[PDB]
């Protein structure tokens, strides 16, 4: 039962962890669109 | 204070040399009989390897000793591992939730690598 | 038992996420160190 | 894996849109013997089995029966009226010598919530130190990156 409850609590935390690297590359990925699309529209 | 098997308050603890634990000494007998070694540390351990007042205050109406208390303490052993064995399965399948979106979430993460890099690599040949 | 183990997996993700931004950097140091260059040479032409 | 924690001061918004993207992603991969038998058919029935209503009630000018019944009564109330005689005896000092190794109980517990507290918040100091050190190095990595993108076009 324990044993068990450490590997969720494990994921879970490392789960929404991994989940905030998404929300940052994002919206980095984002930038470089705007960036170059307006560069390589001048 | 309390046995390391079952969760009592021992009435002769017994303590292990190879992990130091106090057990009660009925369980930690039964344990080396079934398989000789130490429960937690799984260690070797025999019963000439283990080294051996409370008080509770038995109730003004204490009949009810046959019928109302041991009804309630099997009632209680019966209600709790059922719920236990109830805790148990979802826990496993709730382990299987959070692997698989964890590989889910992996798999964002290598194609946002991708993803990005290259973005970012476009800027750099853009000026070119 | 869950810090003690966000320490283990975060610790190794930063050199990662550094190694990949000093490569990131050195590559945009050379576009710096070639453009001016071509700066560079127009004088020469003067 | 690297997401800071400390150093990122990341919305609801956020969450709610990274957890759409690892949905679609999630969208896309989709011991004993007779014992236990009574004791779980027990529990999962829910019905405790009926013990012996019987000396609480009985009837006088019964028959054979009852002259069992009533037999029982008296010497249960022998054991009854010598059980509460022993424990009337010591009477509340037998009481309050358990009472004090609850308290000895209860404090051990306690102080092992301050070890795990102590433990814990330690952890969380050091990543602190680690996420603060990498976050200045982001930093000074971005402006860097800023810097290059606009030279480079003003070379050109």
Avoid at chain 1, 12 to 41: F, G, I, T
Wanted: charged share 30%.
């Amino acid at each position: 039962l324990d044993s068990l409850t450490k590997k969720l609590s494990t994921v879970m935390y490392e789960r929404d962890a991994a989940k905030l690297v998404a929300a940052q590359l994002l919206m980095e990925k984002n930038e470089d669109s705007k960036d170059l699309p307006k560069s390589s529209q001048q | 204070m309390l046995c390391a098997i079952s969760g009592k308050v021992p009435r002769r603890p017994v303590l292990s040399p190879k992990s130091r634990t106090i057990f009660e000494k009925s369980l930690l007998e039964q344990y080396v009989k079934d398989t000789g070694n130490d429960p937690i540390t799984n260690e070797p351990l025999s019963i000439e390897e283990i080294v051996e007042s409370a008080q509770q205050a038995s109730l003004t109406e204490s009949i009810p000793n046959l019928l109302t208390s041991l009804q309630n303490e099997w009632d209680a052993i019966m209600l709790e591992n059922f719920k236990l064995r109830s805790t148990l399965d979802s826990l496993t399948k709730k382990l299987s939730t959070v692997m698989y979106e964890r590989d889910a979430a992996k798999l964002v993460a290598a194609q946002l690598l991708m993803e990005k890099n290259e973005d970012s690599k476009d800027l750099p040949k853009s000026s070119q | 038992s869950t810090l003690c183990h966000h320490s283990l997996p975060a610790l190794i993700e930063g050199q990662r996420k550094y190694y990949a931004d000093y490569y990131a950097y050195r590559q945009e140091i050379r576009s710096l160190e070639g453009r001016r260059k071509r700066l560079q040479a127009m004088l020469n032409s003067s | 894996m690297d997401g800071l924690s400390f150093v990122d001061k990341i919305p609801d918004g956020y969450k709610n849109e990274i957890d759409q993207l690892v949905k679609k992603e999630f969208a896309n991969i989709k011991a004993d013997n007779s014992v236990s038998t009574l004791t779980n058919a027990l529990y999962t029935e829910y019905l405790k089995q009926r013990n012996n209503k019987k000396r609480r009630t009985p009837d006088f000018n019964d028959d054979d029966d009852t002259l069992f019944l009533e037999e029982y009564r008296r010497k249960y109330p022998r054991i009854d009226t010598s059980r509460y005689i022993p424990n009337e005896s010591s009477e509340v000092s037998l009481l309050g010598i358990v009472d004090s190794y609850l308290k000895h109980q209860e404090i051990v517990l306690d102080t092992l919530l301050p070890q795990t507290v102590s433990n814990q918040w330690r952890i969380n100091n050091d990543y602190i130190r680690q996420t603060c050190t990498i976050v200045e190095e982001m930093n000074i990595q971005q402006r860097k990156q800023i810097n290059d993108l606009e030279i480079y076009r003003k070379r050109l």
